[PDB]
From a paper:
Unlike other sirtuins, it has low affinity to free histone tails but demonstrates strong binding to nucleosomes. [name] is a 37 KDa protein composed of two globular parts, a Rossmann fold domain that harbors the NAD+ binding site and a zinc finger domain. The conundrum was settled when it was revealed that nucleosomes, the in vivo cognate substrate of [name], dramatically enhance the enzyme activity toward acetylated H3 histones.
[name] could be fitted into this density with its zinc finger domain (resolved at 3.0 Å resolution), associated with the acidic patch of the nucleosome and its Rossmann fold domain (4.0–6.0 Å resolution) interacting with the DNA terminus at superhelix locations (SHL) 6 and 7. We find that [name] is bound predominantly at the ‘right’ TA-poor arm of the Widom-601 sequence where DNA interactions with the histone octamer are looser. R175 packs against H2B L103 and serves as a classical ‘arginine anchor motif’, binding to the acidic triad of E61, D90 and E92 from H2A. [name] presents two other arginines, R172, to contact E56 and Q24 of H2A as well as Q44 and E110 of H2B and R178 to contact H2A E91 and E102 from H2B. We find that three highly conserved arginines from the Rossmann fold domain (R220, R231, R248) bind the phosphate backbone at SHL 6 and 7 of the nucleosomal DNA. In the full extent of the DNA movement, two turns from SHL 6 and 7 are detached from the histone octamer. This alters the path of the terminus DNA by 37° and breaks DNA interactions with histones H2A, H2B, and H3. In our map, we do not observe helix α3 and we speculate that in the context of the nucleosome, this helix assumes a flexible loop conformation that like in other sirtuins will bind the cofactor only after stabilization by the acetyl lysine substrate.
Residue numbers in the entry:
A (entry chain H), B (entry chain D): 24 to 122
C (entry chain G): 12 to 119
D (entry chain C): 4 to 123
E (entry chain E), F (entry chain A): 38 to 135
G (entry chain F): 16 to 102
H (entry chain B): 20 to 102
I (entry chain L): 26 to 61, 85 to 285
Write the structure that this text describes.
Amino acid sequence: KKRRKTRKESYAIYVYKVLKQVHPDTGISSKAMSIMNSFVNDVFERIAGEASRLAHYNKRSTITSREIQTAVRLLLPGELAKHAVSEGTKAVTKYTSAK
Amino acid sequence: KKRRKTRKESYAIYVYKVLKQVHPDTGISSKAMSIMNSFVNDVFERIAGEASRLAHYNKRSTITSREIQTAVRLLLPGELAKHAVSEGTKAVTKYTSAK
Amino acid sequence: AKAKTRSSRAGLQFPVGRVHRLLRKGNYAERVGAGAPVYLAAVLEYLTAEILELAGNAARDNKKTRIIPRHLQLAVRNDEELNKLLGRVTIAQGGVLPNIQSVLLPKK
Amino acid sequence: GKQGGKTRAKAKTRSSRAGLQFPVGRVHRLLRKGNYAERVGAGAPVYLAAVLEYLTAEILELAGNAARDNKKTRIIPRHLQLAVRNDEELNKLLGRVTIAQGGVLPNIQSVLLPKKTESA
Amino acid sequence: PHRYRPGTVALREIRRYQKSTELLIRKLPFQRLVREIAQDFKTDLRFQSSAVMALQEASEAYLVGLFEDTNLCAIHAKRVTIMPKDIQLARRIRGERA
Amino acid sequence: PHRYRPGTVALREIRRYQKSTELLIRKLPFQRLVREIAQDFKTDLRFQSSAVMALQEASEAYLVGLFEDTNLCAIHAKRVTIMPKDIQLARRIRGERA
Amino acid sequence: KRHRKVLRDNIQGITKPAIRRLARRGGVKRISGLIYEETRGVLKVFLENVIRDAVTYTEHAKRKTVTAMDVVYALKRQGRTLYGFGG
Amino acid sequence: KVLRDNIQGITKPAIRRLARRGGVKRISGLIYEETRGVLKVFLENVIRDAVTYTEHAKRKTVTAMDVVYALKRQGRTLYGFGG
Amino acid sequence: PPEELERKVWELARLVWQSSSVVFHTGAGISTASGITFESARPTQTHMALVQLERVGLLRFLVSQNVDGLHVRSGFPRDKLAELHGNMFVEECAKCKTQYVRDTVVGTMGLKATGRLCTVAKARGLRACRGELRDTILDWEDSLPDRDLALADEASRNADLSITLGTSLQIRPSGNLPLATKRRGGRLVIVNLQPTKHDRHADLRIHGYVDEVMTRLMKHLGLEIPAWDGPRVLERA
DNA sequence: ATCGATGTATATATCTGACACGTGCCTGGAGACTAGGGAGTAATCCCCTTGGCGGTTAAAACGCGGGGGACAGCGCGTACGTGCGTTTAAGCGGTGCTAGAGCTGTCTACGACCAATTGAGCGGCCTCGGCACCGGGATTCTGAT
DNA sequence: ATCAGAATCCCGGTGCCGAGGCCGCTCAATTGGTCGTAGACAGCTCTAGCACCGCTTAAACGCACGTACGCGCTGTCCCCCGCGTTTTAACCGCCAAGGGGATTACTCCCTAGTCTCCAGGCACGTGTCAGATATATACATCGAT
Ligand SMILES: [Zn+2]
């Protein structure tokens, strides 16, 4: 053993948890889980990178929910963006309930 | 008037000082100077962005002469890369002289 | 008091607290505001829910019960908006959509 | 003792020390404020200034030649486009860039033109 | 009485507009087009003078670069006349329509 | 005695290979080619087994996408057959050959 | 009208001879009569894609003028960088 | 012939299968050497970056991550092997 | 008749002696006169005599049409020459218009790319030029090599005695440059057995073998023609 | 239009290794707290943007004439697909060795922070010459003969 | 090609406003120095990469055949070009006026940083069923008669 485990993090449990919420009978192979994990990391790098540019161009030091929203509105095409911003505001307002 | 002046930095004097070193009997228009200033800002953002990714993939905190050197070797094509690397090593060794 | 993960508080499965660390330590900006990780986790969950819905339906149409790389490629390329989001991505073992140009097909 | 700095060294800039025209201090300050990494080592901005100076000297060399061939003596955006696009390494570096007021290189696709006599 | 051969004036036009560097679309029409398009995204937008010039420079350079690629496609099909299908092929291969 | 007519088994191969996940180049030949190229840049390199697989997935995806755009050009020129000039037109319009 | 104008039909102001001159700079010898309505369509699609981003940059900035930097960043995002406007 | 050059390991039938996977009905006899030149240029551009990332890491082994980062730079992001 | 030829060649020796700014023009016959590879052919006596006339100052400037490049092979000082059609020994840099000389012939023709990328290194440690090298063979009836035309026209507008050897003046502008020597009030001499379009225009017309005429001319100037001591490479007089 | 043999389908049983779930462990997310600076917000100066008007004259629009280009047909030659029999070597499994990836430990050279000092770089003003314009003289072509 | 004659080039005059130099001042770079941790260097261990042996049989190879596609040529029609007249509104110069950029001062809400607490997420283990394979059998479809 000698602590060499090192603990590799992934989105695997959350992709699985979302899959079971959407299609309860379906499962996912380890190659497909690796692809889904890569997709999340790519889209995360894009949205965070565009939010960084928006903060910098406006001389702001903070990425806020506005920067993530405009980054989403710039990155995601068409109707996918409009549903994404709806789910984004719903989550942020629910998280601000009682707060 | 009225203490409302606001300075904007530019590469213009350095581009001019390099121009008179390469062609002593030549001038540059304000639009050509604005283009050169934008070219420098683009190439700076490319090299610094790749040096950042290089540092992060290797789990290092510091951008160094390494990281800049390998960013330059990745970004520039052809002999433009080998000459840029020769000039960078010449500048860093001259700067380290008498340390 | 008993701890509740910021994901459960936000009504979503994706890890708000992990996405907040990944923002703070990714050097994206000097500061990351408390709404940013919630909004970003909600968007990543929605995009994974869309691609998994379409992939699960493609797998069910192929009569399988596990998602494999074909079903992810079929789901992305048959959708006009996910295909534009993933325009330059290649998926390992995904194959390509079954298309043939009309003039290549037989005359009768 | 710090009174030495108050009376000695005479502010030999990092550029003049490295033998550069480009501003090492400004390139360093931009690398720190741009959030590219947690730390920025002493050789990084000297190297980056040397490279930006090399690339600007390269474009100004080619643009000054283009200006001279047009019998001009001040460089205008046309000469920068003529410099960048006639060099195979710079055209690949600036492959996604449009230069304002630059136009395009004089180029006709050869099948469009008429044809000529010969006698050996 | 005098008449240049059709296509020879067109050839001089190529040579001239490739030598030159000014903008080719009329400035007032391009301003009104940009304002009509932008009116779909917000009401009562205003534009800086340089902002419209930058939209014209970028759009006019894009149109020119597309016509180069369109000409390549027309020539490849053994034509000298560009047609809508050539613009459509160039836009398909460049990944704009794909 | 029996023989299928020309182009119909090619059309069956289009219909088959578009239905499959598999890699289409032989694996040991692709190993020797990747090593031959890498030895020009550094002597005595090793490869992770999965690094060779990542290169094969990317290079086969690239060649397939290139052949799809090559087919569009051949069809536009009123040909069923792809030719080297179609590959060169696709690569010029995409910005690889320019 | 001194304030609050609405616009339409301005696309036909990108004149037939204007499209000709652009094709000339791009090396075109001969142009079919159908090209003008196709090119107006392409120009409008391009120009909407740049303007949508430019206006989302104005909205993020909380201001009512489109600036040259908004257009420069919109073009940079789309892999189409413009030099000469202060970027 | 035992004296095979490595680039001729990308056989004519392997190229046919790649073209058929891309919807190509009929393939000219000059396509194969052009396709090999295209493939060698693609691999030189990806391997040069992967070897640059390897040398930068002070290690002798090319890893799946060095290939993924080379492909991400080229504008050809590959999902399957990591982030 | 040979006696009339000798008297006219004597008078040509007087014209050449007396004239202060002699310009030679040459065509393909004079270099062909050894019985003509471009690499293996030794220069004909005419060429060497031209070098000898240059050495004594009986030549202001030289023009030629001869694609053989034997004027280049003879090391006639390059700065005093024009070879209006281009030369199988000579290539040019596109990007910066420097020139060169080579051991091998170029072989290609038509201002095409000869597979070399220039060699001019630069201060301030910038790249070497890397510019495409290109052959000098014009193909047909373009604008000539710009400097070679300008100098040939200039010298013609500035010469009091043109002399035209193995020349048909029919190629424009080339043979017409000798009309600028005439138009300014200078003299013109033509030496050929063949017809020519401007044949009416000269002060002296010779019919006879050009190597024999030039060998006689040299004898009448009292000069030995130098035998060729192998190939020559003088950029400058 | 029917007929036949080929390939894709489909139904069956059967065997096997990847995924789904369970358990133990330790790491990182959380909770409650503090400290200070980022950016929200309001009030002001004044730039530059939008609108309106009258002349001008360059460009756009309409027409008409006609020639060169698109493109539909058809003919011929060679190049590429389908097939089958022979040769190669890729793929498999097994066994062996040791280079180097990966981790853990120890140390110190590097660079972030900080305050005090100065000149390098910016905005603004003014001069004058590089160059846009052009009207005049020549030549260098292209149409007239 | 010969003939004047355009058609354009080369040049000297003129003129203006944009490039280059100069000034002065302010804030960004430099200097000297301390602190503490990122990372370079060494030592070990055990993964997985490279090398080799031989066996099987899928695949590549190479040769024959002939069909259909490429592309070369040609004829006919109509669509676009060039040019002349008229119409238009782009352009420009002026003048009006106020929306909204940009800069400033105030101030409190927010998020970095901290310590300790504990349960979520990772690695490791093991069992079984979703799926792959082998085999039997029915239907779909292609191409010849
Ligand atoms: Zn050169």
